[PDB]
Design a protein around this ligand. Structure first.
Ligand SMILES: Cc1cn([C@@H]2C[C@@H](O)[C@H](COP(=O)(O)OP(=O)(O)OP(=O)(O)O)O2)c(=O)[nH]c1=O
Ligand SMILES: OC[C@H]1O[C@@](CO)(O[C@H]2O[C@H](CO)[C@@H](O)[C@H](O)[C@H]2O)[C@@H](O)[C@@H]1O
Ligand SMILES: [Ca+2]
Ligand SMILES: [N+]
Lengths: 554, 412
DNA sequence: TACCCCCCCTTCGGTGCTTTGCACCGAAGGGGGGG
């Protein structure tokens, strides 16, 4: 045979042999287009005949190339991949057009039979053994071994990406001012050279790739904008995603909403204000992917206004390293947030959203902090720097939060923007007891077996209450005891509890909770003007805690 | 052209497979420039994806360094080479290092590039350099010499190090020298002027053996512990005594002599929190005896070299931070408090990073170990900013906790 | 009835402290997207 470029040594997991599984009963309609190109591979040295000396076998099928009449060859290596050594992928992420700098001339080109242009390792070729079917079951079919990277192997992508870089390294060093975005076999080549000199250096690279046996077909070659790259439409000074089609189904299943959710998450990168909360509330706890489920009036409203955003076309701009990065966040309600990253006002680089519900109890300040951290990581990935933040939270509101919180928290260089709705703290626990306010000694208890319990309080003025509770836990009675003292007290109240569980939840100042009992406590805390929470150990003969501990245990 | 010491992982253990986290532009530019010159000098060489192992890498600037310094997160690799740098080529720890009036740290990491590395172990030193906006896939490398930040590196170089130090250890007999990874700790009871002079002598003593030094000044004798203190009030409210009894109840897990029976008697009623409560005779005496027990050292606390060190940190607000170092719960080996550090009153993450660095430095001087930290911070908040403020050549183990302050035990 | 990478949204099951209830997180399956 002939050796084109430098190979990569491959092994198996130690103490294991090759794949020995039988083929699929493939239909003869695909066998016609299969043996066609398969026989053409031997002439080019891509595939070779093997004798019965090779005791391996793996299934083979084929699917059509999307938006094309040509067919793609796939080989099922699932059993081979389970026994093949592990790699470390050199693909760390996906390039985004918002990180592209403006270039005077741009060229995009695809690599014909990419995987099939890289030689496999010599000693490993035997394990790619597979048989080819026929029109009838009489003829056996030639068995082959791969001389190149096959489509369907778990090691083909990583070896191709690394080998492509070693070929492009000499050219990148000879042409330092040329930007080459390498992603699998698609290459984005841009420069500030004149369009005349640009296409000369392009042909210099096409010859450089051809020097190592890499084809650059003209049909895949793109010389004029708008360039179709990574599912985007790259214009000389703007970019946008390729058009997005939303399903027009009258009756929606689970797979329909899932397709709709993913389409909206993809659109949220440039189309501002996409929300998927109410559409995602339909896919919770569902069993069958084919199950039909009706649309709520909330999700019906959400899908309507989301379609109006996709109605008018939007676009993004390119990155200017000389100007600062600005990120502005807006609150959308129900734990939903959106943001726009821009350098010039009203000219967005990209958009996005953060709507993850982290924890059982939280507030708007925590979720804004989590959104800033999501934007920071996203911005460092795309541009390598942290943007300047414009946050809908008062400077003194944030100061009060992070200084009083028991956990360390921080937000980078930011300024306040007066765009409602503003993020605020809905109540503030007093640091010292309140003079003249009634002091409620609360406690609760529940039986592990009976699930019944009591919750009550005793005050310094003689006030008292005990309430029987059904199908409750020890923690719920302690929260319930706090709910009672908030209900039966004035605008200012001192509360003494022994529950570490309840005190830890309330001191973090949440404004939302999965527990409906906690939401009612929050509702009461907002109504109050001064609340003081204190903790004491139980069974120590302390204050009214000993007296109320006796009441809730009888 | 030097013999390579063979290195093997712990029995039944695979190499490190840790993902590379995104890097800023200034750190990627610095790493590309550093890795380029390290390749033309043969210290590293590019590899491919057939290596299934990987270790994170980023860049730092030491305190007032202004020059970038490469740093690899070998924490995962060191846990898988623990058999090497502890049992085999371990280093005894000088108990007198913490007693010197001044200790200086020097970065001797550049000398490890002289000794080659075992060929069978270079497959575990793999690291990947990312690209901005994923313009280029990962460029992977491997170390051909002793890597900076690997715990097996100072153990191999120890034989070469003690020969370079032997002339100066004889010219100055009573000066203590300790080596922890890429750092060299040298302490003396000499005056500040004499101490800094002998450092330069050690710098020139290392220059003629082929090593540069791109110095931190410590004072271990100045370090003070933080004890549990009770307030001084001319009048006590119900809430004051309630917080006090709860604090003494929690403190009873450390000092068993704490009693609360005479302070709980003052709370037997159902009184308002702001109501003033006069102290009885037995309560004043029970409080007086409790203040004395907190003056005593904890009974039966001593360091165990076979146990790991645990470090807890509490944010006290207004720039104050408290910490405790222990091996067993409630058997603290040291307690302390930091204040007015960099980033105070403006940046919580910078203060915590500075606190972790100061605590780890103290643990290396006193015991020669790095503790595992329980950080009062969320995972996503810490993993986003901690690299922007890290100024040390080592990285300790850490986990994240969320313990609300039900009782302010360590600071008033 | 193929492989590899990134993203969000949900479930579920393991973990440890708030404790045998409750809260958290990481793996996993659903989808979108890239080659
Ligand atoms: C879409 C797809 C891509 N690849 C990778 C990307 C490329 O490395 C190579 C196939 O690439 P090619 O066939 O060269 O790409 P192409 O489809 O544009 O075809 P061609 O230029 O001949 O007209 O495998 C798969 O293995 N499975 C897939 O489902
Ligand atoms: O492999 C983890 C190794 O590094 C640390 C801490 O940075 O853990 C890191 O890598 C882990 C990968 O699972 C994650 O915890 C995160 O990347 C990061 O914490 C060490 O604590 C650990 O030994
Ligand atoms: Ca192609
Ligand atoms: N109780």
């Amino acid at each position: 045979p002939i050796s084109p470029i430098e190979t990569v040594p491959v092994k198996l997991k130690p103490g294991m042999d090759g794949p020995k599984v039988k083929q699929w009963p493939l239909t003869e309609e695909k066998i016609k287009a299969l043996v066609e190109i398969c026989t053409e591979m031997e002439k080019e040295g891509k595939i070779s005949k093997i004798g019965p000396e090779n005791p391996y076998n793996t299934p083979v099928f084929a699917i059509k190339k999307k938006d094309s009449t040509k067919w793609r060859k796939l080989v099922d290596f699932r059993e081979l991949n389970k026994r093949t050594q592990d790699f470390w992928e050199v693909q760390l992420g996906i390039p985004h057009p918002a990180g592209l700098k403006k270039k005077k001339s741009v060229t995009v080109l695809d690599v014909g039979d990419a995987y099939f242009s890289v030689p496999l390792d010599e000693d490993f070729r035997k394990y790619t053994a597979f048989t080819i079917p026929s029109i009838n079951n009489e003829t056996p079919g030639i068995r082959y071994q791969y001389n190149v990277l096959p489509q369907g192997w778990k090691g083909s992508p990583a070896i191709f990406q690394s080998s492509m870089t070693k070929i492009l390294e000499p050219f990148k060093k000879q042409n330092p001012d040329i930007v080459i975005y390498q992603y699998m076999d698609d290459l984005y080549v841009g420069s500030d050279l004149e369009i005349g000199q640009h296409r000369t250096k392009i042909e210099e690279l096409r010859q450089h790739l051809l020097r190592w046996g890499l084809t650059t077909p003209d049909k895949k070659h793109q010389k004029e904008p708008p360039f179709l790259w990574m599912g985007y439409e790259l214009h000389p000074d703007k970019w946008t995603v390729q058009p997005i089609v939303l399903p027009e189904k009258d009756s929606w299943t689970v797979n329909d909403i899932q397709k709709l959710v993913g389409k909206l998450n993809w659109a949220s990168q440039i189309y501002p204000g996409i929300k998927v909360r109410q559409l995602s509330k339909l896919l919770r706890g569902t069993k069958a992917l084919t199950e039909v489920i009706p649309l709520t009036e909330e999700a019906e409203l959400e899908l309507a206004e989301n379609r109006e955003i996709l109605k008018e076309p939007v676009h993004g701009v390119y990155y200017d390293p000389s100007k600062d990065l600005i990120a502005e966040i807006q609150k959308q309600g129900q734990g939903q947030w959106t943001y726009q990253i821009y350098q010039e006002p009203f000219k967005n680089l990209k958009t996005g959203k953060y709507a993850r519900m982290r924890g059982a109890h939280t507030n708007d300040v925590k979720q804004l902090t989590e959104a800033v951290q999501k934007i920071t990581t996203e911005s460092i990935v795309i541009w390598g720097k942290t943007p300047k933040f414009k946050l809908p939270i008062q400077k003194e509101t944030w100061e009060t939060w992070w200084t009083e919180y028991w956990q360390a928290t921080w937000i980078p260089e930011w300024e306040f923007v007066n765009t409602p709705p503003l993020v605020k703290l809905w109540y503030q626990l007093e640091k010292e007891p309140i003079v003249g306010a009634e002091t409620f000694y609360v406690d609760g208890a529940a039986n592990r077996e009976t699930k019944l319990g009591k919750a009550g309080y005793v005050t310094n003025k003689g006030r008292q209450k005990v309430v029987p509770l059904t199908n409750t836990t020890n923690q719920k009675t302690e929260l319930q005891a706090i709910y009672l003292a908030l209900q039966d007290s004035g605008l200012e109240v001192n509360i003494v509890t022994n529950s570490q569980y309840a005190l830890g939840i309330i001191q973090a100042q949440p404004d939302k909770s999965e527990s409906e009992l906690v939401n009612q406590i929050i509702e009461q805390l907002i109504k109050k003007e001064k609340v003081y929470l204190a903790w004491v150990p139980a069974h120590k003969g302390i204050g009214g805690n000993e007296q109320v501990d006796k009441l809730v245990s009888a | 052209p030097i013999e390579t010491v063979p290195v093997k992982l712990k029995p039944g253990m695979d190499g490190p497979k840790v993902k590379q986290w995104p890097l800023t532009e200034e750190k990627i530019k610095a790493l590309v420039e550093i890795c380029t010159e390290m390749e033309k000098e043969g210290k590293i060489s590019k590899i491919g994806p057939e290596n299934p192992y990987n270790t994170p890498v980023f860049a730092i600037k030491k305190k007032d360094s202004t020059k970038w310094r490469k740093l690899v997160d070998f924490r995962e690799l060191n846990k898988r080479t623990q058999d090497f740098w502890e049992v085999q080529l371990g280093i005894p720890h000088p108990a007198g290092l913490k007693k010197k009036k001044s200790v200086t740290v020097l970065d001797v990491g550049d000398a490890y590039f002289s000794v080659p590395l075992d060929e069978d172990f270079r497959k575990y030193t793999a690291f990947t350099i990312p690209s901005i906006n994923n313009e280029t896939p990962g460029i992977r490398y491997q170390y051909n010499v002793l890597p900076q930040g690997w715990k097996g590196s100072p153990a191999i170089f120890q034989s070469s190090m003690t020969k370079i130090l032997e002339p100066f250890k004889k010219q100055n007999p009573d000066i203590v020298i300790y080596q922890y990874m890429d750092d060299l700790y040298v302490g003396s009871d000499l005056e500040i002027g004499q101490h800094r002079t002998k450092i330069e002598e050690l710098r020139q003593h290392l220059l003629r053996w082929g090593l540069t030094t791109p110095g931190y000044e410590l004072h271990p004798d100045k370090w003070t512990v933080q004890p549990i203190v009770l307030p001084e009030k001319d009048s006590w409210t119900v809430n004051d005594i309630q917080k006090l009894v709860g604090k003494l109840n929690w403190a009873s897990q450390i000092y068993p002599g704490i009693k609360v029976r005479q302070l709980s008697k003052l709370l037997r009623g159902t009184k308002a929190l702001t109501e003033v409560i006069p102290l009885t005779e037995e309560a004043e005496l029970e409080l007086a005896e409790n203040r004395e027990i907190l003056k005593e050292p904890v009974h039966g606390v001593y360091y165990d070299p076979s146990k790991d060190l645990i470090a807890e940190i509490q944010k006290q607000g207004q720039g104050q931070w408290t910490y405790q170092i222990y091996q067993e719960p409630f058997k603290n080996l040291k307690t302390g408090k930091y204040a007015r550090m960099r980033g105070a009153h403006t940046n919580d993450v910078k203060q915590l990073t500075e606190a972790v660095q100061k605590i780890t430095t103290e643990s290396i001087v006193i015991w020669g170990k790095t503790p595992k930290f329980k950080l009062p911070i969320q995972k996503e908040t810490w993993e986003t900013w901690w690299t922007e403020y890290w100024q040390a050549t080592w990285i300790p183990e850490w986990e994240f906790v969320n313990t609300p302050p039900l009782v302010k035990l360590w600071y008033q």
